[PDB]
C-alpha cells in the first residue's frame, strides 16, 4: 500500500509475495540467495518476511549445492544473512528469525552456539523456546557423558619447547 522510496527518492516495488513463493520452491539454499539477487535487480527489496523464508530454506534444505562444499555452515549463512537485513539493509530481525537460527544449532549439535543464541533471544526477544533450550542442553550432556566437551588437542598438555608452531 504505502510507497517506500530508495536513497534517491524513487519509488520501489513492495510486492514480495511472488518472490517468496519462488524461495519456498528451492531445494538448495544457495538457490535462495539467487532469488534474492533477482529481487533486488528487479527493484524489489526483500522485507522481513522474505528474509524469514530464506532462513527457513537454509534450515530445511539438505545442502548449499548439489555437490558438497568444503566448509559449508548453515549457521554462518544465517548469521551472514541477518547482518545484511540489520546492518546493511536497515531492518530488524524478529523472533522467528532467531528461532530458526536456534533450531539449526540444536539440529547441528553446536550446543555452545545455542547458549549464545539463547542469551541473544532472551536479551532481544521475550525468551528462548524452552523446548530448544532443553534439546541444546541435552546435546551438551551427551558430549560430556562421551567426554567430548572440547577438542582433544586443546586438552593435551604443552610447554614452551613442546609446542609445534607450524
Amino acid at each position: 500500500a504505502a510507497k517506500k522510496y530508495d536513497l534517491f527518492g524513487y519509488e520501489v516495488d513492495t510486492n514480495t509475495a511472488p518472490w517468496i513463493e519462488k524461495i519456498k520452491k528451492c531445494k538448495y539454499y544457495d538457490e535462495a540467495g539467487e532469488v534474492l539477487v533477482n529481487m533486488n535487480v528487479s527493484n524489489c527489496p526483500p522485507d522481513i518476511a522474505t528474509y524469514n523464508a530464506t532462513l527457513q530454506c537454509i534450515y530445511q534444505s539438505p545442502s548449499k549445492q548439489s555437490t558438497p562444499v568444503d566448509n559449508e555452515s548453515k549457521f554462518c549463512a544465517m548469521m551472514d544473512l541477518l547482518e545484511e537485513m540489520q546492518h546493511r539493509n536497515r531492518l530488524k530481525p524478529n523472533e522467528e528469525s532467531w528461532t530458526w537460527v536456534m533450531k539449526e544449532c540444536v539440529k547441528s549439535g553446536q550446543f555452545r552456539l545455542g547458549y549464545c543464541i539463547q542469551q541473544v533471544m532472551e536479551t532481544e526477544c521475550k525468551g528462548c523456546p524452552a523446548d530448544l533450550v532443553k534439546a541444546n542442553e541435552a546435546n551438551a550432556q551427551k558430549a560430556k557423558t562421551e567426554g567430548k566437551e572440547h577438542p582433544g588437542h586443546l586438552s593435551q598438555q604443552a610447554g614452551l619447547f613442546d609446542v609445534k608452531v607450524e
Binding site: 536513497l7 534517491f8 527518492g9 524513487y10
Partner: protein, 488 residues
C-alpha cells in the same frame, strides 16, 4: 533569429582518438559550433562534436564530447546552428546536468523555457561594478578575517577531512537565506563516488528539495568523460550562473571543484590537437584559457557572481604554472587544516594562513579593519606565548601576557560556529551571525569587557548573546551541582 549554418550537412573526413575532421560542402560553420553525428552506427550514446579549428574553407577539426567508437568515415554530421546550448532558468534548480545540459538525474524532463550558448564574452569594462562590496557569508571567521568580495574568486585550499562539503553547503544555504541568491556547483574531473555523496548529502540538508524548492544546481563532468567534456563543464555551469546574474540581478555563488582539473583537461585537449606544450608541459594558452573563464566571473551593475574554487597544488609546488597562474585571479584565500579540525574547531580554518584583498579601510568599514587586525595581532602573539609557556612555564608569563593568553584562547574558541546544515547530525541548532554582531562581539572581547565569562561559553556558539545565554545555562546548571555536592 537563426544562424545560416543550422542544418548544414557534412561528412566525417578523418577520425583520430577524440579528434574528428568534418567536411562541409557549403562551408565549415564558425568555430566553437556544435555538430551532431546523425549516423546511427549502433552506438549507445549520441556523438556531439565541437569545432575548434578550421583546416580549410570546407574542412573543420572538432573534439568529441563522447567516445568516438564505431564512428566510420563519411558519416553524416549536422550542425546545430550554434555553440553548445545549455538550459537556463529557475527550472534547473535541484537538478543535475552534464556539458550538453541534459538531466542525468532521471527525474523527468527539465521543461526549460530558454537556452544559452556555453561560450559568452566576458562583461565589458563599462559593466563593472561601481565599487567593491562585501559578501556577508554569515560565518564569523570568514566575515571577520577573510571577508568575501562580491564578484570575486576565493581559493578554498584544503582536502578531505576538514569539512569542505559542509562549508560548501552552509555557504549555499546562507547566501540564499541572506542575499536571496542561488548556487551552481561544477564538478570538473570529479570522482563519481564523491559526486553521488554530495547529491545525497544535499538532499538531506534540503538544499536540493525534490518535493519543495531547491537552491542549488549541479553540473558534473566526471573523470570518466573524455577531456573534451571536462574542459567545458565549468563554462556550462558559469553560463547558468550568468543567467541569474543578468536576467534576475541576483548575487550567485559558483563553486568549481576543482579549478586544477579544468587546467588539466584543457591541457590534454591542446595536446590532442598537436600544439607544442609550454614549460612544465601545460598548454601554451594556459593564461588565456583561465582568463576566458575567470573574467566572466565578476560583479556587474545588474548582479554578481562570487566563485569559490577548490585549488589543488601539484607536487606541493606553489610555483607550478597552474596554481601560479590561478593565484593571479584569486581575490581571497580560505585555508582548511586537519590540525584545527582535530582540536574540535569547526569550521577548521587557519585564520593566520588565510588572506583577502578587501581587508582595507577603503573597502570595509574602518572599525571592521581595526578589529580584524587586532585579532590577527593577538593570535600571532598567542602563538609566540605558546612557545614560551611550553619552554619556561606558564607561571613565567607577566600579567599582561596572561591576559593576552586568556583573551586569545577565548577568541580561538569563539571562532567556531554551528552550521544550520549540521542540525540533523550534530543536533545543536545552527546560527547565522550578522556582520554587525561579529564586529561588536569580537571588539568587546579584545577590550576586556567579557573577561569574567568562562572560556567554554564561546565554544560552538553564535553571537555574543549566545555566549551570555550559554553562561546562564552554565551558571544555573552548576548551581544545582553545588546544592547536590553540598548535600548528599
Amino acid at each position: 533569429p537563426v544562424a545560416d549554418h543550422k542544418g548544414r550537412v557534412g561528412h566525417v573526413s578523418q577520425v583520430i582518438g577524440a579528434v574528428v575532421d568534418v567536411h562541409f560542402a557549403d562551408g565549415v560553420p564558425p568555430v566553437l559550433t556544435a555538430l551532431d553525428v546523425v549516423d546511427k552506427l549502433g552506438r549507445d550514446e549520441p556523438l556531439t562534436l565541437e569545432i575548434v579549428q578550421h583546416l580549410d574553407a570546407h574542412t573543420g577539426r572538432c573534439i568529441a564530447m563522447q567516445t568516438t567508437d564505431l564512428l566510420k568515415l563519411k558519416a553524416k554530421v549536422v550542425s546545430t546552428g550554434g555553440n553548445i546550448s545549455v538550459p537556463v532558468g529557475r527550472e534547473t534548480l535541484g537538478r543535475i546536468f552534464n556539458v550538453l545540459g541534459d538531466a542525468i538525474d532521471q527525474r523527468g524532463p527539465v521543461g526549460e523555457k530558454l537556452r544559452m550558448p556555453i561560450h559568452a564574452v566576458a562583461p565589458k569594462l563599462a559593466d563593472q561594478a561601481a565599487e567593491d562590496a562585501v559578501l556577508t557569508t554569515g560565518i564569523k571567521v570568514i566575515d571577520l578575517i577573510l571577508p568575501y568580495c562580491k564578484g570575486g574568486k576565493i581559493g578554498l585550499f584544503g582536502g578531505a577531512g576538514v569539512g569542505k562539503t559542509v562549508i560548501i553547503m552552509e555557504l549555499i544555504n546562507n547566501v540564499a537565506k541572506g542575499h536571496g541568491g542561488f548556487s551552481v556547483f561544477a564538478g570538473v574531473g570529479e570522482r563519481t563516488r564523491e559526486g553521488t555523496d554530495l547529491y545525497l548529502e544535499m538532499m538531506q540538508s534540503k538544499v536540493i528539495d525534490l518535493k519543495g524548492e531547491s537552491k542549488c544546481v549541479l553540473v558534473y563532468g566526471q573523470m570518466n568523460e573524455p577531456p573534451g567534456a571536462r574542459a567545458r563543464v565549468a563554462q556550462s555551469a558559469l553560463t547558468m550562473a550568468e543567467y541569474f546574474r543578468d536576467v534576475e540581478g541576483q548575487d550567485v555563488l559558483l563553486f568549481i571543484d576543482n579549478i586544477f582539473r579544468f587546467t588539466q583537461a584543457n591541457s590534454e585537449v591542446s595536446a590532442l590537437l598537436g600544439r607544442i606544450p609550454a614549460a612544465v608541459g601545460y598548454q601554451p594558452t594556459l593564461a588565456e584559457d583561465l582568463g576566458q573563464l575567470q573574467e566572466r566571473i565578476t560583479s556587474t551593475t545588474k548582479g554578481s557572481i562570487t566563485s569559490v574554487q577548490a585549488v589543488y597544488v601539484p607536487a606541493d609546488d606553489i610555483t607550478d604554472p597552474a596554481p601560479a597562474t590561478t593565484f593571479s585571479h584569486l581575490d581571497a584565500t580560505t585555508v582548511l587544516d586537519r590540525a584545527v579540525a582535530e582540536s574540535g574547531i569547526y569550521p577548521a580554518v587557519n585564520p593566520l594562513e588565510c588572506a583577502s584583498r578587501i581587508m582595507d579601510p577603503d573597502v570595509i568599514s574602518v572599525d571592521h579593519y581595526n578589529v580584524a587586525q587586532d585579532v590577527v595581532q593577538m593570535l600571532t602573539k598567542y602563538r609566540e606565548l605558546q612557545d614560551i609557556i611550553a619552554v619556561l612555564g606558564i607561571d613565567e608569563l607577566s600579567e599582561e601576557d596572561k591576559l593576552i593568553v586568556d583573551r586569545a584562547r577565548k577568541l580561538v574558541k569563539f571562532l567556531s560556529q554551528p552550521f544550520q546544515v549540521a542540525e540533523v547530525f550534530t543536533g545543536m541548532t545552527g546560527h547565522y551571525v550578522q556582520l554587525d554582531d561579529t564586529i561588536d562581539s569580537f571588539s568587546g572581547l579584545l577590550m576586556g569587557t567579557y573577561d569574567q565569562v568562562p572560556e567554554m561559553a564561546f565554544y560552538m556558539v553564535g553571537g555574543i548573546n549566545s555566549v551570555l545565554e550559554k553562561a546562564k545555562k552554565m551558571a544555573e546548571e552548576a548551581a544545582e551541582l553545588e546544592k547536590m555536592r553540598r548535600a548528599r
